[PDB]
Structures are given as C-alpha cells and as structure tokens.
Amino acid sequence: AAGTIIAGAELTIGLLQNLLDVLANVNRKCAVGVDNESGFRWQEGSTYFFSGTADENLPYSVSDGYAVLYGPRKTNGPVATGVVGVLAYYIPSIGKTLAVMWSVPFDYNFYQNWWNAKLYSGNQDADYDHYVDLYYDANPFKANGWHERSLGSGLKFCGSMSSSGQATLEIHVLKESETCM
Amino acid sequence: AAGTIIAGAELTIGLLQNLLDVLANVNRKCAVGVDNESGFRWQEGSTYFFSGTADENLPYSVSDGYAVLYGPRKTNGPVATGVVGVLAYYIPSIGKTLAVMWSVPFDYNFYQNWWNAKLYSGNQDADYDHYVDLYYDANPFKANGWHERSLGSGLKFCGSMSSSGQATLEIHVLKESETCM
Amino acid sequence: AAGTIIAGAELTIGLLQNLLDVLANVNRKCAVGVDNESGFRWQEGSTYFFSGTADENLPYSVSDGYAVLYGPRKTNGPVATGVVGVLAYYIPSIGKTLAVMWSVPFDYNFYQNWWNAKLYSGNQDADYDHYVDLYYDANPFKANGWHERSLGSGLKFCGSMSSSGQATLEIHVLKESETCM
Amino acid sequence: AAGTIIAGAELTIGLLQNLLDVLANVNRKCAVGVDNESGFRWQEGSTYFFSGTADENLPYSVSDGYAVLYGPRKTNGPVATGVVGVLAYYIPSIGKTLAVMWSVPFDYNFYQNWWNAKLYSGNQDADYDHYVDLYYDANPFKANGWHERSLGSGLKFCGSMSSSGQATLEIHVLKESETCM
Amino acid sequence: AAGTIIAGAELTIGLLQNLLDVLANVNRKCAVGVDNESGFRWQEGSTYFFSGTADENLPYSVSDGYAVLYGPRKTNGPVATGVVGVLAYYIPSIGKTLAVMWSVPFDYNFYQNWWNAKLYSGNQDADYDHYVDLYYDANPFKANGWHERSLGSGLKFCGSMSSSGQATLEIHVLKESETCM
Amino acid sequence: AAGTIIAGAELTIGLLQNLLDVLANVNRKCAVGVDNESGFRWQEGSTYFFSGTADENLPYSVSDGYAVLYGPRKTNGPVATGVVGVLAYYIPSIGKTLAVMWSVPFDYNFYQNWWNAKLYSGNQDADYDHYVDLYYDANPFKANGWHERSLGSGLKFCGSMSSSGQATLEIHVLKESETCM
Amino acid sequence: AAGTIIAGAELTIGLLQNLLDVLANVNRKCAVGVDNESGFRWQEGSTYFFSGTADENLPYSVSDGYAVLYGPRKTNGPVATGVVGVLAYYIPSIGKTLAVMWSVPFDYNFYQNWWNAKLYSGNQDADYDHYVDLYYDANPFKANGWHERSLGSGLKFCGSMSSSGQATLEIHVLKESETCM
C-alpha cells in the first residue's frame, strides 16, 4: 500500500533535486571595471549588495590612470537571485562621492541588465538608498552598447554593459574636456 | 494501479529531460570580425539582439587599421533561438552610422545564415528597425563565400560568412579606391 | 497490462537513442589544401555545399606561392549525410574561374571519395550546376593516389585525396611548364 | 511486510547522506592579510578559534613593512559551523598586544561577516575573552567596504572584509601620521 | 508472457552491443616507412587498399635520401577486416614502377603479417592485380626480422615488419653496390 | 522468506562499506619541521610511533643552520587512530638527547593537538617512556600559536603547531642568548 | 519459468566477462637491452616468438659501442600466454650468429623468468629450434641477479633479468679480455 506512496516521494524528490541542482548551477556575475581618468584620486571604497557578493575587496584608493577591477557574483547554492549592488568612492578633491550601480538579474523574463553612475555630495557609504536612487530615480542605462553622461563638478563618464548574465561592465570616468577612450 | 501511472510519468520525464539537455547543449555563435580600413575613426559602439547575447563589450571606438572582434552567442539553457543582432558605430568624419547585421538561426530547416551592412544618416542606436531594414528591406547576403558592395559616401565593404552554426563573419570596410584585402 | 507496453517503448527508445548517438558521433570531414603555384592571383572565394558546412571563411584572395587551407565537415547531429561541395575563385589574369570539388560520403557501401578541378569562362559563383558538372560530366578522380590534368589557359593541376572518411585533399595548381611539386 | 520498512530506511538514509554530503561540501574560509606599516616589530603570534582551524602557523614575528598572511577555514566533515577566531601579537615597543578578530558564519540567515581589531595592555594570549570583547563589546565592522579606526598608542588601522563566505580580510596597521595605503 | 521475451531481446542486444564494441575497438595499422637510397627520384605516388584506408596522402615524389612515411589503418566501426594494400611510385630514371605491399590481418588464427616489394615495367597505377602478384605469385616475407632481395635494374631492398597488429614496416631501397643501412 | 533477510544483509553491508570508506579517507598528518640554530650538531635520528607511520627516514644528523623536515601520517585503511610519536637526536657536544613529541588525534571530540620538546641525559632511543614523559609528565603545549621554553644546558626552543588535523609543527631550537627567529 | 534461466545466463556471462577483462588487462613484457661491446658489427636482425609480439623492428645492424633496445610484449586480448622469444644477429667478423632468448610467462605458478645467449655456426634465422636449444638444452639463467658466461670465439657476455612480469633483460656482450661493465 504505502510502498507506491514512497514511489510518489521518490518522483517528488527526484524532480526537486533536479530543480535545486539547476538553480545552484545557474551562474550570474558582473566583471565591474571602473577606470579613473578623472585627474582626481578616489578613496574609501564602499560596497552594497541587494543581491550577490564578491570574493575580493575593493582597492582602498584609485589614483589617476588606474582602474577598479571588481568581480561581484550570485550567492552559491539554489538562491534564485542575481547580482545587484553599488560600489562607491569618496573624491576629496571635489568633496563628493562617485557611486556605480549594476543589476544582473536571475530572471530575464521580468528583468534585464542595468547600470548607472552618479556623484553625491560629501562622503557617504554605499547602501540601499543609493541603490534606489541609481536604479529607479536617476534613469539607469540598458546593456545595449556604449553610453556617455556628465557627472557635474567638471567630470563625465562613458560606459557599457554586456547584456548577458555573466556581464562585463566597463566605465571610464573622465574630465569633461576629454574624448572618451 | 497508479503505480504504472507513475511509470508513465517516468517515461514522460525521461523523454523531456533528454529534450531539454539537447536544446541546452546545441550551441550557436557568431565570431563577428569587422575591420576598419576606411580611413575614418568609428565611435559609440551600439548593439541590438533579436536573439542571443555577448559576454563582452564592443570597443568604444575603432581607429583606421584596427578591427572590432565581437563574440555574440545563443542564450544559455533550452531556449531554442539562434544568434540574431545588429552592431552599429557612428562615423563623425561623414556624419553617418555604419551598421552590421548577422543571423545565425537555431532551425536550419526553415532558416539559413544571413548578414548585411549599410550606412544610415546621422548618429543612431542599433535597434529593431535597423534589424528589419538590414534583414528584409536591404537585401542581405547568404553564407556562401565572399561578397562586395558600396556603402555610399566614398566607402565600400567586402565580407563573408561561414555557413555553419558556429559561424565566422568577416567584413573589411574600405574606401572605394582600395582593393579588397 | 499496459506496463509491458511501456517495456516495449523502453526497448524501442533504447535502440533509437543508440542509433541517433551513432549517427551523431560518426565524423566526416575534408581538409582541402589548394596551392597556387600558377603565377596568377586568385580572388572572390566562393563556396557551395551539397552536404556539410565549414566553421571558417575562404581567404578573399590567393597570391602566387600561397595555399587555400579549408576545413569542410559533416553537419552536427544525426544527419546521415557526408561532406560534398565546391570552392571557386576568379582568376582575373586569364578571365576564368577555378573550381575545385570534393565528395566525402556518409555511406561507403554505395559511394566513395571523389574530387575534381576545372576552369570555367568568366566570373561565376560556386553553385549546384558546378557540382553537377564536376561530379558527373567532367570525369572526377578516385581517392587512390596522385593524379595530374591540364586546365587549359596555360595551367595544370596535380592532386590527391585520402580515401578515408576524414580525408585530406591536396591540389597543386601549376603552369604547364612546371614539374609537379 | 518489513520489506517496505527497509524501503523507508532506504528513503531516510538517501535523504541523510545527501544532507551530510551538502554540509561537508559547503566551504567557508577567511584569507586574513594583516600588514604591518606601524614602525614596530610584532612577536609571539597567538591564535584562538571559536569555530574552524588553519593548516599553517602564524609567523613568529612581523617586522615593519611585512604582512601576516593566514588562511583559517571551516572544520572538515558535516560540522555546520563557520570560521570564527582571533589572532594576536605582542608589540614590545609599546607594551601592548594587537588582536584581530574575524567571523565568517555557516548560517547567513542569522549571521553575517564581521571583523575587528584592538590593542590590549601587556602581553596576552588570544582566547575566548578577546573574542567576546572584539565581537560584542568593541563594536565590530560589517563586510561592506573599507573602514578606518585609531588603536591608541600612536597607531591606526584601515581594513575591509569581503562579504562572501570565502572571504578576504585585509587590514593595514599604520602610524596615525600616515595615509592609508 | 511476452515480457520475458523482451528479457530474451535484452540478453541478445546486450551480447550484440558488446560484440560490436569489441570489433570497433580492435585496432590494426601499419606504419609504412620506405626509404629511398636508390640514387633515383620516385614520382606519382599511387595506392590501393584491399582492406583499410589512410588519413593522409603519399608524397607526390621521393628524391634520393628521403623517406615515404605512410600510416594506413583499419576502417572505423565494427568492420572485422585488417589493413591490406599496395603503394607504388614511378621511377623515370629506369622506366619502371616500384610497388610495396603489406598485409596486417584482422584474424591471426588464419593469417599473419606479410610484406613484399618489386619493380614492374612502365608507369602503372597500384591496383588489385599488383596485390595478387605481390601477395601470392611473388613470394612475400613473414614479419620475422630483416630480409634482403634484388629488384633488378641495379636496385636492391632490405626491410622488416613487426609481427604485431599495429605493425611497423621499414624498407630501405638501395643500389646493389650499397650495404644495407 | 530469507530473501528480505538478504535485503537486511544488503542494508547492513551498505552502511558498513560507507563507514569503512569514511574511516579510510579521513586523513591525519603532521609536517614536523625542527630547525637547529643551537650551535651544536645533532646525530643518530631515532623515532617512535604510538599511532601512525612515516614514508621517509630522518636525516642521520643535523648540523647548525639546517632543519629536520619529517612527514609522519595516519596508517592507511580504516584504522581510526591519529598520528602520535616522538623523534629524538643525540647532541654529543652536551652529552644529552633532544626529543620532540607531537600528537594529532583521530577523535577531536575527546582529544586535541599537542606537542612538546625536552633534553634527556645521555644517548637514548625514542620509545614509549619518552612519549609518556613528554605527553603527561612534562606539560605539553596546545596548538594555539607560538610558545617558548628553556631546555637547560644553554639551549632554548620556540615552536608552534597548527590546530588542524593536517598539522604543521614548527620548532626552532636556539641558544638562550638568541632571539627566536 | 525460463526467466530465472536467463538469470543463470546473466550470472554466467557476468563471471565470464570479468574473467576475460582480467586475462586482457594482465600485462607481460620484456625490455630487452643487448649491448655490443664485442669489437664486431652485428647484422641481419632476426626474431622468433613462441608467445607474444613486438610493435617495433630490430635495428638492421649493431656497430661496436651501441645497443639493441627491443620491447617484446604479450598478445592483446584475453590470450593467457606470456612473452617468449629469440632474437638473433649474424656476426660476419667471426662467421657465427649470436642468439638471445627470453621467457616471461603468463603463469608463475608453473613457470618463472628465464634467459640465455649463445653463438651458432654460420648465418641462421631465429626459429623454434633455437628456442628449444636455448630454453632446454643450453642451460638458461633464472631472473635472480647478474650472471656471466663465455660464448667461445673470443667473446663473453654478462647479463641479468628482472624477475617480475614486466621484466628488464640487460645483456652486455664483451671480448674475453674485458671487465663486465
């Protein structure tokens, strides 16, 4: 009697372990290259994750002519969330903090890759209120080739994001007088 | 009684997991080499995908004597769609944008590899209306050896596409006075 | 009752998946080396496939003292067709097109490896009517060692084909005054 | 009768071996880099683990301009505990001991990565009372980018921790007069 | 009823797939080294297979002090035939063709490795009538160490064959005045 | 009837082979580095194992400025014992023998890593009575960072042990006048 | 009824395939090094196998100060026979042939490794009558270290054989005036 009820448990557990091995093996990541051609040194590298993590620290500071390379990724195991976060640096030469946001979803049926960058007044930690401002209020970019925008304070950026789910985000931060790389 | 009805579920799930592992493991890609011998610098690399994605960015710009190497691919998982997209660059020295299209289908029973290239007036992002113009209205080429065509504005291209489903697309963009590589 | 009818479906699907894995894993290819010792530059590399594909382009042109290396192969999956095709180049110094044909069958019970080469008047794309002329009307060669023939127009070729199903085709195109390599 | 009761034992043992293989294969570690820019030699490297172990010794001493690299990790087998510990060194030039704490949990539903550093009066071994002081009483830092704090005695540190579960902890110990690396 | 008749089909197919995997994995080959110390250039390399194939061409010609290296092999799949063939070259300096034969059977219960070499009058393709002459009428050698024989026309050969089923055949063709290598 | 009693034997043997494969694959070892900075040559390297073995010999002697590297390990197979042993050397320049002890248990529920070192009067082989003296009577050290102690006879040691179960033991033997490495 | 008779066929075929995979995977070989320090050139390398084969030829000749390296092996598949054979060379400077014999059995319950060497009058092929003379009539050596014997004609040999079943046979052939290597 109950034997085939175990057979029903076996079919259920077989389907469930296949689900959890799929949600575990689905990989999402961003390579986040942010290149400082701005003429100003950046410091106090701060990070926030709405989703995901990174296995490495930011550089403490970024002098002129050097890049942040950062490798944020999806949480291990069957978590079903993408990579979504902010990185921010203080720029003491202008009294403002540069923040950069990326979103690399789990579910491309409802979401797509987005990125943004902006300056905020004073020294600020990266947190949820920068994520909300960069992702909803400050008009982020799609992962559909190169885009350029002013930051204010004599600075500018150009950047692009791959549209895949293992995405490269590249940003060059420049003075307004300079041609994008 | 219901036991063999589980046996029917097992035969169904066995056939379905084999289908999804086949549609997952079928690989489609284009290597898209576009070589700038045109005498003019290209900028603001823009991309559109009707199907597929790429794990890398375009170069921001392409100076004379250098090539775009770009590796667009099918979406991961059992998606059953090929690679189909446009890449476009602004050419400020002539006030026009060069666009390049490729199609590398999933289903070779109904489709084949196609490519095209053209100039459009002014700076334009790559999007669906360039895909429709390059794929239906502007007479694309089959993947059957080398073809050559004028762009207007003193420019020309020659290119070819492999007919496989892991295709190489090679295009040389030239001045009208030059012999194709 | 129907249980063993599933057992009959299991025996059928087991035999069928073994068939499709055999027809998938059977590999057919030609390495097609065509060496230009003719004293004339070749251009506008054109290709036709009756069966199979290649993952690479032809060279656009072939200057004197250089070779076309081309790697046509069977279609992936359980297709049960070999490699069969034409490659052709225009020779502007004589106003004719050199075409080369190879056939590397799936089914050696009914077919064998064949190759041929000829000049045609004017610039022509490779297509089915060159395949029919080279394979039926123009007396192709078996894969049984080296053969030599005149092209007309002061040119000659010598070539050979391996008889295997992963065949090397080597052709040297020469002036009539020259000893085959 | 009892046969299917063995079937119940088989379903139970199958679920349990999968649990123990998951809790075994879940990996937690900290790479603990502590860099001595303090102008003073450190000695008598001491360690405490609340959870986990390391496969290597501390350096006995750390001269000025050199770093402790230490690789503490989770206990092998299905232990279900993270990495949590203290490392401490005596600084004879000031008569105090520098301690550094990290926590890299097993269970991110209830815990997160934390770190701290402080000076204690006299030579002291690392033990549980330093763990309690550094983790509860002395206000530890989250793994959310770079932080800086004074130690007293003319010394300062800046450091950061990755938020992952295979975390990098980097600390630079500096004189109060110096800019963080 | 018919259920165990499927059981009989399963035992039959299990025994048959093991047979076909054995006949497929049994490997037979000859490495055929023929070294030209004869003082005369050889040309128009011709080949015949009674059994097997090769994945490479002969050299078109063999100048004095150089060797034919050729790698004939058994047909892929469960074919149950060995390697058996002739290679032949024209020697225009004497008006004769050198032929070399090897046999490397599938079935060592009924056959063994044999080889032979001879000169024939005029230019001739390798075919079945050379195989019959070299294997039955012209007294071939066993694979039992080095043998030497005159060709006529001032030429001689010494050679040996391994007796294995992955055999090396080595032949040195010499002038009658020379000591075998 | 007895059929399911075989089923009970199968469940028993399945659980037992999993136990013996776990107790076999659990690895315990010590890397035992003992560094001679003592100014005196050591000789007649002697060893005792209470548990475990080593696949290598001691050096016969250790001159000043050189180290014993020794790799004692758990016995292969499902033995359920750790590594526990003594190594000893005669020091003829002082008429005493240096012994070093380590313990690296199998069962960390009841035991932990311990080490010790001492001088004994005259030449003595390492045996069980040195193990008892070093492990119970002579106050061994825990694997919790660096420790230092006098040997008498003008000599001193500092050392540390990793607390893992694949432990590094490092000892520096020094003159009383010297600062520990 | 007949169902369990198939079960009896399954137990029989399972035991038989395990037997044939054991008799197939059991490897027997000899590395046969014969070193010519004799002052005389050897020629016309001849071989006989009572059991086994080799994948390589002998050298045609062996000049003074050079060695025959030869790698005879067991027949592939479940043959249940060892390696047993003779190699022989003509020595024209003395008008005699040196033969060397080795035996490397399959069945060490009834046999052991043996080797021998001798000179025979005139040029002779290696065959069964040399095997019988070297293995029964001419007192062969066991594989139990180095042995030395005179050949007559001013020559001597020393040699040894490993006693394993993947044996090295080393022989130095010397003049009677020389000390064995």
Add this chain to the structure above:
Amino acid sequence: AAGTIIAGAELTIGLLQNLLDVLANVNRKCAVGVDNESGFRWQEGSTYFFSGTADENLPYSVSDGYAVLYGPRKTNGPVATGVVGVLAYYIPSIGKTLAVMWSVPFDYNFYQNWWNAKLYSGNQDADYDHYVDLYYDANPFKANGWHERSLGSGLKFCGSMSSSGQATLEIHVLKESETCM
C-alpha cells in the same frame, strides 16, 4: 525457488570481488638505497625474493662514492604477501660478499618492517639461507630510526628504515675510520 539461491551467489560474489579488489590495491614496496663509501668496488649484484619482485636490475657493480638504488615491490594481483628479500654483492678487495636484507610485510598485525646487513666469506649468490641468517640468526633491526654496526674486515654500516609499508631503506657502508654521513 533457486532464484534467491542466485541472490545468495550474488551476495557471495559481491563480497568476494570486494575482497580481491582490496588485496589487489594494497601496495607494499621498499626503496632500497645502499651507498658505497667503503673504498672498495662491489660487483656481481645478486638478488633473492622470499616475497615480491622488482621491475629493474641491480647495477652490475658499485664503485666507491656511488649508490645502489633498487625498488622491490609486492606481487601484482590479490597475493596477500609483502616484500621480503636479499641483495648481495661480491667485494673482491676483501674476498667477501656484502648482503642486505629487508622485510616489508603484508600483515602488520603479526609482523613489522625489519632490515639487516652482513659480510659472508667468498663469492656467494643471494638465496634462502642468507634470508634465514639475516632475518633470524644475525639479529635484524626494527624500522625505528638510525642504527650502526661493524661488518668486520675494516668496514661498518649505518642505516635506517621507514616503518611504513611503502618503506625507504637507506644504508651507508663506510670504513670503520669514517663518521656516518
């Protein structure tokens, strides 16, 4: 009826194949390094095995300042015997033979590693009567660190053996005037 009797045969054969795969995979070996610092050349390397074999020959001779490296091992397959043997060399400068014995058992419940060395009068082959003398009558050494003993005839040895079952045996043979390495 007899069906479950086959089930009893399956449980028996399953337990037996696991036994034979364990007794096959258990590896026993000795690396036997014997170093000649004796001032006298050794010759005619002889070997005896009570258990095991070696895949290599001894050196024929050992000049002063060179070592015998020899790698005796357990017999392949499920033999359940260790490595036990003698190696011996003649020393013509003193008219005696040096023999060395090692024992590396299969069964450490009843046996342990032993070694010995001695000189015997005149040239003698290694055989069972040297094994009996070296293992029972001449007081062998345990594998418990370095030991030293006189040979007579102005010679001495020091040596050690690892206690594992993949043991290193190292022996230095010296003149009585020399300090052990």
